[PDB]
Design a protein around this ligand. Structure first.
Ligand code: EG5
Length: 109
């Protein structure tokens, strides 16, 4: 598996019951978020690790046809059959790096 981008973001998951964003993995803070490319079957996953303690806070597939929503220049989100994910980027450049790679992945799936 090959990293096609690295971006700084606080990884959030939406608490449907309480209608509130909560930190992925339970601990507030920024992570290094990759998109990893598995070339063997041309699959991509979002994998993010907290800068402080290396905890994996997100590890989710990127399916063909995903709707990736750029709500703001620093807050992007998407949904799967179970959860809603949100990335609160540390900078506009980080959001741009990540969005570029996500859009690339969705084009070649
Ligand atoms: C129908 C639907 O699911 N729509 C999604 C967006 C979306 C559109 C298209 C494809 C996928 C997605 Cl996830 C949607 O809007 N969702 C699902 C999570 C809850 C939310 C529905 C309503 C609210 C409106 C506010 C927005 C939201 O949560 N925002 C806007 C960007 C803003 C930026 C940062 C974060 C953290 C600070 C603040 C907060 O949560 O207090 N916040 C937000 O308020 C974020 N919201 C959402 O993101």
């Amino acid at each position: 598996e090959q990293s096609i981008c690295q971006a700084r973001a606080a990884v959030m998951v939406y608490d449907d019951a309480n209608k509130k964003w909560v930190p992925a993995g339970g601990s507030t803070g920024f992570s290094r978020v990759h998109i990893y490319h598995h070339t063997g079957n041309n699959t991509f996953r979002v994998v993010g690790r907290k800068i402080q303690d290396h905890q994996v806070v997100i590890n989710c597939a990127i399916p063909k046809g995903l709707k990736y929503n750029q709500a703001t220049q620093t807050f992007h989100q998407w949904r799967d059959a179970r959860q809603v994910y949100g990335l609160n980027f540390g900078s506009k450049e980080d959001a741009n790096v990540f969005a570029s790679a996500m859009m690339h992945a969705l084009e070649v799936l």
